[PDB]
Write a protein that binds this ligand. Structure first.
Ligand SMILES: NC(=O)c1ccc[n+]([C@@H]2O[C@H](COP(=O)([O-])OP(=O)(O)OC[C@H]3O[C@@H](n4cnc5c(N)ncnc54)[C@H](O)[C@@H]3O)[C@@H](O)[C@H]2O)c1
Ligand SMILES: NC(=O)c1ccc[n+]([C@@H]2O[C@H](COP(=O)([O-])OP(=O)(O)OC[C@H]3O[C@@H](n4cnc5c(N)ncnc54)[C@H](O)[C@@H]3O)[C@@H](O)[C@H]2O)c1
Ligand SMILES: [Cl-]
Ligand SMILES: [Mg+2]
Ligand SMILES: [Mg+2]
Ligand SMILES: [Mg+2]
Ligand SMILES: [Mg+2]
Ligand SMILES: [Mg+2]
Ligand SMILES: [Mg+2]
Ligand SMILES: [Mg+2]
Lengths: 207, 206
């Protein structure tokens, strides 16, 4: 029963509640949460109504309890292994990123063109790089159902389609291209132009 | 007044409307927009009630007129020049990104440690790299926005340096909460939280 726009804030509330927990805060008000997130307290309260919590009275939401609620809903106690497709400027950078404090989110497999110089190599942390033509062979017995897509924009749709045929069910795409994929496939876009336009909008509201 | 959570979608609506316009769609429904964005029609309808005559009906939204609305509210007809601070794995990647079709959003200079090999040089697309100690010298400038891609351990210190030099907004990639003055805006790119969102949605499809 959580609305989709509220669900897109789960992971942000999780981050903030872990911080508040680490800071020894027992009860967090809607205004403190809003301020941390850069939204309005009214949106916070409505959102939290879907998490079982009223926010109109009392001293705040129970930090430990909610933190644990977010952890459970985001499946933060189990591991998700993802593949990275396109090991160029941004893809190579992402191989260096620590996605999770407890390694519950990891890149476990990467792909590039069969002829790319990285193909055949393995990272310091044991992520092999394969050719894209081998993807179906590698995904046969695999636990990976999630891909990060960092190919050139001109190639994103074609590679996305390859991924879905291979069994990928969700894609975190960095290309600024709308992907047309089947309805049961989730695509999450990282759009840094849209992030900067947001930022600038808020900067202009402060002036 | 547009609520802050609605304002965080302006840029997303702008992308969608530019696509619909390019595709020759004259009128869009709340459901078509919601499906594009991956949210609920009801959220779209409420948001658009804050966009004036153009969104009051809750249906048949005029694509060209709303695209123009979003371009105006986002100041998409003028140029924003930004600086990048930290030319490492992700910083160097970003210097290769084309942020805007019409170059209205651009990285115009970058910074690293004074001792970094890239300092004194120019990137592929001819962006100059300077040492962080010289930031206040470089900032007579039109730049009031930074992208922050230093190590996580250095993010707060470098953020403080930016704010002292005159930066008013920071797009941060470090998974570190920054404590800065109220009048400084920080937008956090948090790839962990993006992937958690994606997996939540994937689990809802099963
Ligand atoms: N550069 C950035 O930091 C940044 C930021 C945001 C978005 N983006 C977007 O991310 C995408 C990639 O950008 P980039 O600058 O890293 O591109 P890039 O050109 O450096 O790298 C793309 C990689 O994908 C590989 N590739 C090409 N076809 C492939 C295929 N069929 N299968 C597997 N791999 C294939 C290439 O060999 C290359 O290694 C682009 O759409 C870009 O717009 C980049
Ligand atoms: N690797 C990724 O793709 C990725 C993705 C998401 C988030 N992040 C985050 O982005 C940040 C940077 O990651 P990275 O792997 O690119 O780090 P990195 O160590 O490769 O790069 C950091 C750069 O910052 C420079 N630097 C250090 N102190 C500085 C200072 N005082 N002033 C100016 N420059 C300074 C360094 O010389 C170096 O070039 C980290 O917080 C990381 O968690 C990285
Ligand atoms: Cl949203
Ligand atoms: Mg909302
Ligand atoms: Mg997780
Ligand atoms: Mg090849
Ligand atoms: Mg979505
Ligand atoms: Mg590009
Ligand atoms: Mg653009
Ligand atoms: Mg189910």
């Amino acid at each position: 029963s959580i609305p989709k726009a509220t669900a897109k804030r789960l992971s942000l509330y999780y981050r903030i509640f872990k911080r508040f927990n680490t800071d020894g805060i027992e009860k967090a008000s809607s205004k403190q949460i809003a301020d941390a997130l850069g939204i309005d307290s009214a949106t916070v309260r409505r959102d939290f109504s879907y998490f079982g919590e009223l926010g109109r009275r009392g001293f705040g939401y129970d930090v430990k309890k909610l933190m644990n609620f977010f952890a459970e809903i985001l499946n933060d106690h189990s591991t998700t292994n993802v593949m990275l497709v396109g090991c160029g400027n941004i893809g190579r950078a992402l191989l260096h990123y620590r996605f999770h404090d407890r390694n519950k989110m990891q890149i476990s497999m990467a792909f590039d063109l069969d002829s790319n110089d990285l193909v055949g190599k393995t990272t310091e942390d044991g992520i092999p790089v394969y050719g894209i033509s081998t993807i179906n062979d590698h995904l046969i017995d695999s636990d990976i159902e999630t891909a990060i897509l960092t190919v050139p924009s001109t190639e994103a749709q074609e590679v996305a389609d390859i991924l879905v045929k291979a069994g990928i069910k969700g894609i975190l795409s960095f290309s600024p291209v709308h992907l047309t994929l089947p309805k049961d496939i989730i695509v999450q876009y990282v759009d840094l132009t849209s992030e900067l336009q947001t930022l600038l909008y808020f900067m202009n509201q402060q002036r």
